[PDB]
Coordinates of C-alpha atoms in Angstrom, one line a residue:
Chain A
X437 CA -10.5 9.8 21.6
X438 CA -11.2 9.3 17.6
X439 CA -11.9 13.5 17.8
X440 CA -9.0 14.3 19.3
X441 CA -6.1 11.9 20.5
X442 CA -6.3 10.1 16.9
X443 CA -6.2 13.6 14.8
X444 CA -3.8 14.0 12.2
X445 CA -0.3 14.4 12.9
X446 CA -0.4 12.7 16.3
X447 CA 3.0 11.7 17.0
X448 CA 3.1 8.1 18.9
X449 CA 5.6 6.2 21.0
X450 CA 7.1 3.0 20.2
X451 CA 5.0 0.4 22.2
X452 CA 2.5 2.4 23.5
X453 CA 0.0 2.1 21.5
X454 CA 0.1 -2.3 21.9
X455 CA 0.0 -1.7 25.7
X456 CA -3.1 0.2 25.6
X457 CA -4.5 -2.2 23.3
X458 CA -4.1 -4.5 25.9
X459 CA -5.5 -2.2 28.6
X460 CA -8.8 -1.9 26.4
X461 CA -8.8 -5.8 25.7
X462 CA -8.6 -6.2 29.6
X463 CA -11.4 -3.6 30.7
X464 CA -13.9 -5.3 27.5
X465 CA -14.4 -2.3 25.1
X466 CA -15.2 -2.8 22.1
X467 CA -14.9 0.4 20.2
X468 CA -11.7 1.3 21.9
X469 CA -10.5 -2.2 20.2
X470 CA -12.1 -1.2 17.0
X471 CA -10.5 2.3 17.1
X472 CA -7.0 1.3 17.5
X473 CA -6.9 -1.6 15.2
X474 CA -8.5 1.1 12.6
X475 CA -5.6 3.5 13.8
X476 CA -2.3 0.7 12.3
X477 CA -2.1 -1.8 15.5
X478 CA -2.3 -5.4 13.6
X479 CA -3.1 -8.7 15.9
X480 CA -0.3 -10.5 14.3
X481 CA 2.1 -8.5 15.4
X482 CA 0.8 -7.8 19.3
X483 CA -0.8 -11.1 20.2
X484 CA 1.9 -13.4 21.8
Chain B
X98 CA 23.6 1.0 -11.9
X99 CA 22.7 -2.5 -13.1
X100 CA 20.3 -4.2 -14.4
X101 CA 18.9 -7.2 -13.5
X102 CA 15.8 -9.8 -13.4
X103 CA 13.2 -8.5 -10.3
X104 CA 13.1 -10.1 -6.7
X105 CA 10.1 -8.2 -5.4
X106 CA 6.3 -9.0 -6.8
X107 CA 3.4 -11.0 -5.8
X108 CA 0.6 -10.0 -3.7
X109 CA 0.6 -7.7 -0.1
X110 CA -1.8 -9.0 2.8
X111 CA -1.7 -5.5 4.7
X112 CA -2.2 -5.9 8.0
X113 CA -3.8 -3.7 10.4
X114 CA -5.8 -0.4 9.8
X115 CA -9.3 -2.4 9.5
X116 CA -10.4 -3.7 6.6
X117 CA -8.0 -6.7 5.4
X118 CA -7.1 -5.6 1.6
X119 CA -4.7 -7.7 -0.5
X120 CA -2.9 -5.5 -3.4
X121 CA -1.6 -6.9 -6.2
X122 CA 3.1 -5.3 -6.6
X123 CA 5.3 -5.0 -8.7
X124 CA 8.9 -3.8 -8.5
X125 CA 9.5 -2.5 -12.4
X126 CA 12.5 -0.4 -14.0
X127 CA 11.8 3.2 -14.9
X128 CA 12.9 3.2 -18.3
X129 CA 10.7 -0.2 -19.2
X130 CA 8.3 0.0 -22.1
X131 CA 4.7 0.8 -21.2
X132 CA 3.3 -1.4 -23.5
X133 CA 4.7 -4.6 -21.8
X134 CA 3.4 -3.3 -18.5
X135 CA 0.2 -2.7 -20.0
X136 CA 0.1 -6.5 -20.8
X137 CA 1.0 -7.2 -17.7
X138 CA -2.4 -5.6 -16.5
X139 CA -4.9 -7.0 -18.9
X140 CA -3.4 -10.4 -18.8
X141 CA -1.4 -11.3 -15.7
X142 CA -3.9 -9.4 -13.2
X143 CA -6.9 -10.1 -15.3
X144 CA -7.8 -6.6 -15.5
X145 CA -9.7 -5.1 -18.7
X146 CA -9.5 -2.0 -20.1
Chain C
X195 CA -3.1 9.8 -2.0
X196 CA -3.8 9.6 1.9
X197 CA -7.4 11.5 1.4
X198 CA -7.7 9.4 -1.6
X199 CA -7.1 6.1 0.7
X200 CA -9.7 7.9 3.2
X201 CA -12.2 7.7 0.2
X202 CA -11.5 4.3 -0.7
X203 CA -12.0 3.4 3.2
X204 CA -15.6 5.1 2.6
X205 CA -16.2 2.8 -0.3
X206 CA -15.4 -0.8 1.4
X207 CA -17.8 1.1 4.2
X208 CA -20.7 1.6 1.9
X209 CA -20.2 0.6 -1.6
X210 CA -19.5 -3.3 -3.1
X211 CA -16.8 -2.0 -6.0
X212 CA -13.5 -3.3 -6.0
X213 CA -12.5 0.2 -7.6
X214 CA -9.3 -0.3 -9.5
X215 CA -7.0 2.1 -7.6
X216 CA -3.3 1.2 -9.2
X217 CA -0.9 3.6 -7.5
X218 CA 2.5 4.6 -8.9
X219 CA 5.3 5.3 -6.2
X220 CA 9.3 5.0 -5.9
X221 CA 10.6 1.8 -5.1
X222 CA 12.9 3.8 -3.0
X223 CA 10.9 5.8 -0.6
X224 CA 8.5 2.9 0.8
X225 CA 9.0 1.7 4.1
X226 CA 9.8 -1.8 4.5
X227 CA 11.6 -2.5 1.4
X228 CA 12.7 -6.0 3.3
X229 CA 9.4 -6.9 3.8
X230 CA 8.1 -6.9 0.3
X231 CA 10.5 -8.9 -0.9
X232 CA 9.4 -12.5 -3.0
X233 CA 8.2 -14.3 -6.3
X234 CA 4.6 -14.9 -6.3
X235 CA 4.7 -14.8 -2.4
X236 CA 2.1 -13.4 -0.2
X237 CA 4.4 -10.7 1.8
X238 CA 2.5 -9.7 5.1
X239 CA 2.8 -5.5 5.7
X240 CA 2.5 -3.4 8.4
X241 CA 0.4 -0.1 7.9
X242 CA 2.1 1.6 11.2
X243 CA 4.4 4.6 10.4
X244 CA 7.6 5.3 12.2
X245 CA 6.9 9.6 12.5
X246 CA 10.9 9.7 12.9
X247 CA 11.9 7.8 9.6
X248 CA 11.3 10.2 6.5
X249 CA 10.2 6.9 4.5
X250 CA 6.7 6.5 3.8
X251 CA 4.4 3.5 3.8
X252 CA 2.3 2.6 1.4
X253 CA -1.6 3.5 1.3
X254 CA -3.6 0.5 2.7
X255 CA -6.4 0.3 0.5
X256 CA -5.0 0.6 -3.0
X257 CA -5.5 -2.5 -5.5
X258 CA -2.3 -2.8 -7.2
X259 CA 1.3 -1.2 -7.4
X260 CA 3.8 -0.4 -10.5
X261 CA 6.4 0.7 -7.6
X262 CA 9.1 1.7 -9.8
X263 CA 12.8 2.0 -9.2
X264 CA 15.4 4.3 -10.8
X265 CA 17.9 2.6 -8.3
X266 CA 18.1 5.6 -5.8
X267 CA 16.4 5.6 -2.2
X268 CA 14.9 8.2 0.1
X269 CA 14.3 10.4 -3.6
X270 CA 11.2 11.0 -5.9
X271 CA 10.8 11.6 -9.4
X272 CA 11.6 7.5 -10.5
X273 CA 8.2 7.5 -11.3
X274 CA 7.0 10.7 -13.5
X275 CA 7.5 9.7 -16.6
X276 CA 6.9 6.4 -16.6
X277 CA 3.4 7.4 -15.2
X278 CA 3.1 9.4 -18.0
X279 CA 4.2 7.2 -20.8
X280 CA 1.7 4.6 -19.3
X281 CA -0.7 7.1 -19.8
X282 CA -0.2 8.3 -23.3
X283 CA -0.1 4.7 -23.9
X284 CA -3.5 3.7 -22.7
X285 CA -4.9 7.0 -24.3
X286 CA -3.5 4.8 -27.4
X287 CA -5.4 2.3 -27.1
X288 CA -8.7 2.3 -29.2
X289 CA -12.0 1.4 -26.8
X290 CA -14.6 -0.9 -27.8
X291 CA -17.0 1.2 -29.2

């Protein structure tokens, strides 16, 4: 996922990448957490 | 244009992409003196030269 | 700037500095000019960028900004020479040798 969905340039929905930060919060992975936070999604503005 | 006292400095908590990194802005005119900037960062930020 | 940022992101990942980074951009062209908005105010900002708005953000790991307006949005060069005075103006200054 870091190699090749996250490469530069990647254009990205609106909302898409919050809902599969939830997805990876619900299935317990870690890196997948790490990644995305690393890759602009902030807690502040997901967690409700 | 006009000109004006500023409305945007202070600090920037940036949120999200890792690492939690607070960096020091200011908004500044283009045509302003460097030496009173210059001031600004050896005494107001507390960095030296 | 962005491969610059990449290097400082290596250096909080291996290396104790607090390298003094200050980045010089328009006022005009960063995205989220609401947001940073205050007088000695901690202003939250988000490091996601919109791919449809031609407005940059900011890089997330630089230590200090000397944003610069000329009064115009959306447009470079507000910054040039006043990067460059700055610099002829520390060049100025004697060091403590």
């Amino acid at each position: 996922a870091r190699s090749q969905i996250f490469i530069y340039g990647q254009q990205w929905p609106v909302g898409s990448l919050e809902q599969a930060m939830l997805d990876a919060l619900v299935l317990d992975r870690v890196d997948f957490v790490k990644l995305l936070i690393e890759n602009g999604v902030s807690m502040h503005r997901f967690l409700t | 244009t006009q000109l004006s006292p500023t409305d945007a400095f202070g600090t920037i908590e940036f949120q999200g992409g890792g690492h939690s990194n607070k960096a020091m802005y200011v908004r500044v005119s283009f045509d302003t003196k460097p030496d009173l900037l210059l001031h600004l960062m050896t005494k107001e930020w507390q960095l030296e030269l | 700037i962005r491969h610059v940022g990449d290097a400082l992101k290596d250096h909080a990942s291996k290396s104790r500095g607090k390298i003094c980074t200050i980045g010089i951009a328009p006022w005009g062209i960063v995205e989220n000019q609401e947001d940073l908005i205050g007088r000695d105010v901690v202003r939250p900002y988000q490091t996601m960028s919109n791919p449809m708005s031609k407005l940059t953000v900011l890089n997330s790991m630089h230590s200090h900004f000397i944003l610069a307006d000329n009064g115009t949005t959306g447009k470079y060069g507000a910054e040039v020479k006043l990067r460059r005075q700055l610099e002829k103006h520390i060049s100025l200054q004697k060091i403590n040798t």
